């Protein structure tokens, strides 16, 4: 019989289908968990365990280690990050536009890039990493540094003691699966956005209805590195309280690298300066130029499906708008 923090935990599990998820409230229920709680749950309300034949244990020891690898000292690129866009990302899967369109393998594919996307994030920027000439930057020639990464480390970790979730797949399934994992994360590093972006806008312009038509890889791929890309920057959308949260970590982020490049004698990042901050004026402006443009063309893609979530973004914005000092 469960625990009562894990009967409390397992009521907060049942809005795991709800944008809006406690995911701060189970990160503290689980016992630094998310990650680990949250996966399961997926796991077994999709069958995936029993689809592609992933043992409980193997699942749940890789959850564990993958989780372990996620800094707890990073206020915002940590397991609760990871959690959440994992979460928002089924979500986004279960979108009625969207019905019966991905298979089985492209739904495993998503849900387990998602996990690893950020996987032992140091909390600095690609460029941080670049200009003090990182071992890490050296291995991957300063190109989507953390991205190649997090992919290199979410597969390695599969090599761990009872860890490789993957044993009972065919080389088949093993190889189309790489394959969208790696296009998936690589498309979250940020100077992919515009591009990406345009790509989808492109797809709205030409968009074909049987619930939505894609016929290619090219295709099918692009809408996956879009939803999980929309995962990634799905904080604005959420509800003011959990924003506020995301927020408050991401500026502790950013200005705990500023006091690094301050300390070093380098140039301090965009919003990264705590005596020369306008928390306010960046989330507009991170609204207004990545988030809304890319939201408002995954809501044409998904017609209606997404309106709340562009409502709530609108309302989020104005909110930090009306906060900005004069
Ligand atoms: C909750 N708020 C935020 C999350 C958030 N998440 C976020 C991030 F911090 C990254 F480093 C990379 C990403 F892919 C992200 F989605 N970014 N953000 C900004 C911002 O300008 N970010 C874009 C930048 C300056 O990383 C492009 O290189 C401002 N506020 C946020
Ligand atoms: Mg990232
Ligand atoms: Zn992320």
Redesign the pocket.
């Known amino acids: 019989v469960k625990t009562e923090q894990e009967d409390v935990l397992a009521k907060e599990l049942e809005d795991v289908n709800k944008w809006g998820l406690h995911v701060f409230r189970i990160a503290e229920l689980s016992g630094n968990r998310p990650l680990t709680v949250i996966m399961h749950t997926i796991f077994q309300e999709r069958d995936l365990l029993k689809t592609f034949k992933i043992p409980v244990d193997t699942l749940i020891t890789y959850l564990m280690t993958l989780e372990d690898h996620y800094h707890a000292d990073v206020a ?1 690129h940590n397991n609760i990050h990871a959690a959440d866009v994992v979460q928002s990302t089924h979500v986004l899967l279960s979108t009625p536009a969207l019905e019966a369109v991905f298979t089985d393998l492209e739904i495993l594919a998503a849900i387990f890039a998602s996990a690893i996307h950020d996987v032992d994030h140091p909390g600095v ?1 690609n460029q941080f990493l670049i200009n003090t000439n990182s071992e890490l930057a050296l291995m991957y020639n300063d190109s989507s540094v953390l991205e190649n990464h997090h992919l290199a480390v979410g597969f390695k970790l599969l090599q761990e003691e009872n860890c490789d979730i993957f044993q009972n797949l065919t080389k088949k399934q093993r190889q189309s699966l790489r394959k969208m994992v790696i296009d998936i994360v690589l498309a ?1 590093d ?1 100077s992919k956005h515009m591009n990406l972006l345009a790509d989808l806008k492109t797809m709205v312009e030409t968009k074909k209805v049987t619930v939505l038509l894609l016929d290619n890889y090219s295709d099918r791929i692009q809408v996956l590195q879009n939803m999980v890309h929309c995962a ?2 799905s ?2 959308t959420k509800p003011l309280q959990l ?1 506020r949260q ?2 408050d970590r ?1 500026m502790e982020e950013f200005f705990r690298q500023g006091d690094r490049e301050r300390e070093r004698g380098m140039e301090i990042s ?2 990264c300066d705590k005596h020369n901050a306008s928390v306010e004026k ?2 507009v ?2 609204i207004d130029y ?1 988030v809304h443009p890319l939201w408002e063309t995954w809501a044409d893609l998904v017609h209606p499906d997404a309106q709340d979530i562009l409502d709530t973004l609108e309302d989020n914005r104005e909110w930090y708008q009306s906060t900005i000092p004069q």
Do not use: A, E, V
Request: no cysteine; charged share 5%; proline share 11%.
């Open positions: 915002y920027s979250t940020m990634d920057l904080n604005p924003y995301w927020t991401i965009p919003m960046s989330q402006g991170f990545i």
